[PDB]
Amino acid sequence: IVGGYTCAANSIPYQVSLNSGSHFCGGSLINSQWVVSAAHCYKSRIQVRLGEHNIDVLEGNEQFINAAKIITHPNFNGNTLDNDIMLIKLSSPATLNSRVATVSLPRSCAAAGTECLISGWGNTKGSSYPSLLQCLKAPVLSDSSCKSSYPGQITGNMICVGFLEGGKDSCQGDSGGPVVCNGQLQGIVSWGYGCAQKNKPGVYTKVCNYVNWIQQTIAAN
Amino acid sequence: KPGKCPVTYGQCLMLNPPNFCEMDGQCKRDLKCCMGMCGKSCVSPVK
Ligand SMILES: [Ca+2]
């Protein structure tokens, strides 16, 4: 997160870290046993870390739970990043206290201008990862804006969230993390051209298109 | 292999994206090993 602020400790209880030796992606806890992330964050072995604030210091609050299964969207295109969504089943459920909670799926897609919270442990510039969870308030942008910034590359499954002036954006290491608007998961950190560049807002998987796929996939697993 | 890697424009927001190949010889048929939006993979060459 470039241009954001350090979150209050544990104020984003649905935010997870995906770890396979170190943090590499974010994720969103949507029920006690299921995390939603980006398909491009796929690894054959993942440990999910819940309750985190300082990813580099055990603060007591953490749950460390391995992934038992990992299901990428069947139509994921690794070359265009269309359908950039995956689900992770925890090998045992997380305990839901005040420091680990679920986030709701959307009831519908967010209107342009809806104000959202984006979070993660990605770079805050060069690099590198901050220790403490970062936070950034940002609005959904019109499809029109999104496609002027990235002509030909925005599918029906992508939304742009942020500022066209730049300065404020998700960055490398925020991949797979949440965009939450009026208490609903609306975006998954996916891609962009650099970070915080002018007319290059972040591109996000449009989670509202996947509500049924999420429920169906969970139902079958 | 003959041809160029395609021009790309975004990058996935992962620091160390996955590489599914290191050289063209690891790619079937006329496919090249190219950095894309998210790491290296076998893709069709351009002109
Ligand atoms: Ca910690």
Residue numbers in the entry:
A (entry chain A): 16 to 34, 37 to 67, 69 to 125, 127 to 130, 132 to 145, 148 to 183, 184A, 184 to 187, ...
B (entry chain B): 60 to 106
Anything the authors wrote about it?
The exact physiological function of SLPI has not been elucidated, but its major role is considered to be the protection of the airway epithelial surface from attached human neutrophil elastase which has been found in pulmonary lavage fluid and sputum from patients with inflammatory respiratory diseases. 1/2SLPI (recombinant C-terminal domain of SLPI Arg58–Ala107) has a potent inhibitory activity against multiple serine proteases such as trypsin, chymotrypsin, elastase, chymase and cathepsin G as that of intact SLPI.
The present work describes the first X-ray structure analyses of 1/2SLPI with P1 Leu residue with trypsin (PPT) at 2.0 Å and comparisons are made with the previously reported 1/2SLPI–HNE and SLPI–chymotrypsin complex structures. Two complexes (one with chains A and B, the other with chains C and D) appear to interact with the reversible inhibition mechanism. Additionally, one uncomplexed PPT molecule (chain E) exists per asymmetric unit. Two independent 1/2SLPI molecules are superposing each other at the corresponding main-chain (Lys60i–Lys106i) atoms and the root-mean-square difference (RMSD) is 0.19 Å. The primary binding region appears to range from P3 Gln70i to P2′ Leu74i by intermolecular hydrogen bonds. In the 1/2SLPI–PPT complex, the S5 pocket of PPT formed by residues Tyr217 and Lys224 interacts with the P5 Tyr68i residue of 1/2SLPI. As the enzymes have not drastically changed the structure of the S5 site by 1/2SLPI binding, 1/2SLPI should change the P5 Tyr68i conformation to accommodate each S5 pocket. 1/2SLPI controls the inhibitory activity by using moieties from P2′ to P5 and can be adapted to various proteases flexibly.
